[PDB]
């Protein structure tokens, strides 16, 4: 029972999601909060690459204030980005802004700065309990990844101590002494690079006599553990990291089958013996290192600027007989070996931590770009024809299936605005039909007479579809179906990835019992159509991590792909908005609910069902928190993003919060005086404002004339409000509530297509590749051939070297035979290139 926790907290569901492995999340200390927001400062800075001369201190101000949005009032990215913008950007036009991107950026870097300061408070209080005065570790937490090495030490130092700890919860070594050094001393010796504590030579004995007093199995074991004191020692190994997280390169070392997998055909034909580079290079190219890492599943090695010559170095900075006695060479070779298995071992740890480090910051970038490359995706708008009278379309999408014009059969669905299936058609007239080739166009015809769709869809397997594709607009040509302007019906592609996924879906066996997996693969396409937001939205978490989204999304851990996506889609589901009662009269429609502002998985469920209960439809917002459905902050988060169809302003974008604001826009819009519109503001009448504005039919332009940098200015100098960007979109809402604002719907174009019906890579099959193919049919003196790809190739008459030795081309060459040739232009809608066959353009 973790649920009701969830369901009852009037927090956002993702905070709570997030902080779950956070003890006392809210309690922070002053300090800790003041170096947090410093802390994610530095962390965005980089990026908007800033001047030298630059000053941070707005921006930093604009941090902090992003900060106290997120961990004190609980707001989401959304709300602060459509209602907060004048809180995250300069003052001055142009300066800098908190990109949403931004805004993700920094509720990630909070969560992992909590988590830090409860494993340093968790440290801190652990050594607090071992009553115990270490001058290393008190030194620690006064004077400032390093917490895991003072905890690995006190386990090293302390273990008795501690082995008593939890309980309570619940003479070799001299030899080590005549050494004339402390471990610890080393440490402090490094932190001024002087050597303070010059180490003392033995007075008399030798090395080896010290240790008779009591073989080669005793000599090592002091070695040993000495050398293991001596790596565990903080300041060294603190010495040791950073000098390597940035003067390091990277060597990659190929494997057994490494050398085969290469042949210099696959991508990495320049990183196969990559050495000695820098932080910068990978910077610049982040993927590189993770295909690395992909293809090791090679290796890679990540070694120091001059590791050989710093180890060395090391002695002359600390453990350094002056001394030319005997004594002090033999004392001098046990320290020297002790100390190089000790720093070798150093390495072997700090170079695994820079690494680890690094492919961290890699998939970071890789999240970044997957995220946008899924955006795009959602991002697209209803399809809309024409243009010129945005009209939601009704439906007909067709495929070619597997494309046997006399075997598979053609077959269509038909889906009407609002989204419904009405009915299919199996098409048995074969199209391109000898005789008679009518018969599939007036059965075309009669079924778009019988439905009138205002668009057509369609998509398939192979190459097959297009031929059906250019027959579908003879088709709608000859029978004159045009719209209202007189131009003919829209036929697009429509990008199947999503519908491929229902097609063998749960989801579609239950939705359609008893219809085929083509009308299901039908069904989908006409739904991608009326909102491609909505089918991402709709498929399982399974199937939404199937996409072929971005080709190194395979390289990022679990978590991070599972962020990638959510956000994304936060982001424009809370752009498009829920009509409330939409979502809980359709369970499709209400699979966008569980991404709007501060609701989730669990949520949604709950408030559908507090929907469901009130056996009546939602009015207003504001009946949202009378009815006791949402609490204070849940409902700030989410008031304008849940809209009603349609107190007037319930139907814009316009924030509930806002409201009054937005009444007295309207009343200056109309240059109502003063005196007038404080009398109806005591009486509590101001939202008449907003009908005197709906009827006036001059509305438009009296809005566009107020000016919002002059307004702006004076609403802040009356209240301490930054209204600028909440104003400027509140006009806009009240010129019209609610408009698209999605980019337009992306139809498969050109290269698309190809790479659709082809299924070829463009770096597999591009201008001016080699491609060999296979002669089929010839022509006067052009030849025709195909591809291994089902693509057909044209050899122009003056390619294939016939006009060169003159004598007809078929003579020249042999019908089915394959032969190497350069491609030239390729015709990607229809599936076809021009290629030539002259040795000059093989060699």
């Keep these: 029972e973790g649920d009701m926790k969830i369901r009852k907290t009037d927090i956002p569901e993702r905070y709570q999601e997030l902080r779950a492995g956070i003890t006392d999340y809210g309690n922070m200390s002053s300090e800790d909060q003041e170096l947090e927001r410093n802390w994610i400062a530095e962390k965005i800075s980089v990026d908007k690459n800033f001047d030298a001369n630059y000053d941070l201190t707005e921006f930093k101000e604009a941090i902090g204030n992003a900060i106290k949005f997120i961990t004190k009032e609980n707001l989401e990215v959304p709300f602060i980005y459509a209602y907060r913008r004048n809180y995250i950007s300069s003052r001055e036009k142009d300066g800098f802004l908190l990109t949403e991107d931004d805004l993700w950026d920094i509720v990630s870097l909070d969560i992992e700065f909590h988590s830090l300061v409860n494993k340093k408070d968790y440290v801190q209080r652990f050594y607090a309990e071992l009553h115990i005065d270490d001058p290393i570790v008190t030194e620690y937490f006064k004077n400032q990844n390093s917490l895991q090495d003072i905890y690995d030490y006190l386990e090293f130092k302390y273990a008795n101590e501690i082995n008593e700890m939890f309980i309570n919860h619940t003479p070799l070594y001299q030899a080590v002494s005549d050494i004339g050094i402390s471990a610890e001393d080393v440490g402090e010796n490094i932190s001024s690079q002087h050597q303070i504590h010059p180490p003392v030579d033995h007075p008399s004995s030798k090395p080896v006599e010290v240790i008779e007093s009591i073989t080669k199995l005793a000599i090592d074991t002091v070695q040993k553990y000495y050398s293991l004191e001596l790596s565990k020692n903080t300041k060294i190994r603190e010495k040791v990291r950073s000098d390597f997280s940035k003067y390091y390169l990277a060597d990659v070392v190929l494997t057994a089958k490494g050398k085969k ?425 101001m939202s008449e404002f907003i009908e005197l504005l709906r009827e006036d039919p001059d509305r438009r332009a009296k809005l566009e004339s107020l000016n919002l940098e002059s307004y702006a200015e004076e609403l802040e100098k009356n209240t301490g409000l930054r209204k600028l960007n909440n104003l400027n979109t509140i006009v806009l809402e009240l010129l019209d509530g609610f408009e698209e604002l999605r980019n337009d719907f992306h139809p498969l174009q050109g290269d698309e297509i190809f790479q659709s019906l082809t299924g070829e890579s463009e770096k597999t099959f591009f201008k001016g590749s080699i491609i060999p193919v296979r002669v089929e049919r010839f022509w006067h003196n052009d030849i025709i051939c195909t591809t291994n790809s089902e693509v057909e190739c044209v050899v122009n008459a003056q390619r294939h070297a016939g006009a060169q030795l003159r004598r007809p081309a078929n003579e020249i060459y042999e019908i089915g035979k394959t032969y190497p040739a350069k491609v030239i232009y390729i015709d990607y809608a229809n599936i076809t290139a021009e290629v030539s066959l002259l040795d000059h353009d093989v060699k």
Excluded at 365 to 385: G, N, S
Excluded at 400 to 411: L, M, N, P, S, V
Excluded at 547 to 564: F, G, R, T, V, Y
Excluded at 646 to 662: K, M, N, V
């Design 261 to 685: 997998e290469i042949q210099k055909g696959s991508l990495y034909e320049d990183i196969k013996y990559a050495i000695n580079r820098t932080p910068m290079h990978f910077r610049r190219d982040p993927d590189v290192f993770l295909k690395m890492v992909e293809a090791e599943s090679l290796s890679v090695k990540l070694h120091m600027s001059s590791q050989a010559q710093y180890i060395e170095h090391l002695f002359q900075i600390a453990l350094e007989t002056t001394n030319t006695s005997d004594i002090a060479i033999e004392w001098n070779n046990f320290r020297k070996l002790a100390f190089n298995q000790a720093m070798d071992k150093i390495f072997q740890d700090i170079s695994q931590e820079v690494k680890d480090n690094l492919t961290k910051n890699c998939q970071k970038l890789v999240a970044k770009t997957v995220r946008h490359k899924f955006m795009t995706k959602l991002d697209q708008a209803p399809f809309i024809p024409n243009v010129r009278d945005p009209k939601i379309p009704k439906i007909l999408s067709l495929t070619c299936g597997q494309g046997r014009f006399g075997a598979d059969a053609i077959i269509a669905v038909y889906v009407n605005r609002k989204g419904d299936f009405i009915r299919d058609y199996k098409i048995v007239d074969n199209p391109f039909d000898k005789t008679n080739p009518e018969k599939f166009e007036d059965t075309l015809d009669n079924i778009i007479q019988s439905c009138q769709p205002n668009a057509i869809g369609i998509n398939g397997p192979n190459p097959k579809t297009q031929k059906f594709y250019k027959r579908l607009q003879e088709v709608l040509h000859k029978k004159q179906i045009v719209d209202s302007r007189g131009h003919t019906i829209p036929i697009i592609y429509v990008e199947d990835e999503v519908a491929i996924r229902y097609q063998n879906s749960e989801r579609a066996a239950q939705e359609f019992p008893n219809k085929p997996p083509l009308v299901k693969y039908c069904i989908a396409l006409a739904r991608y159509m009326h909102s491609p937001l909505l089918e991402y939205a709709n498929l399982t978490s399974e199937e939404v991590r199937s996409l072929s989204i971005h080709p190194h999304q395979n390289l990022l851990s679990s978590e991070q792909l599972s962020w990638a996506l959510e956000t994304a889609f936060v982001d424009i589901v809370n752009l498009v908005s829920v009509e409330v009662n939409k979502a809980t009269d359709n369970n499709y429609y209400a699979s966008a609910l569980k991404y709007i502002s501060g609701f989730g998985k669990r949520k949604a469920i709950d408030f559908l069902q507090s929907l469901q209960r009130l056996n009546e439809p939602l009015l207003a917002r504001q009946q949202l928190i009378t009815h006791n459905i949402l609490h204070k902050t849940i409902f700030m988060n989410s008031a304008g993003f849940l809209y009603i169809s349609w107190d007037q302003l319930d139907s814009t974008r316009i924030h509930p919060e806002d409201y009054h604001l937005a009444t007295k826009v309207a009343a200056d819009a109309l240059e109502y005086d003063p005196d007038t519109i404080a009398e109806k503001e005591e009486q509590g009448t």
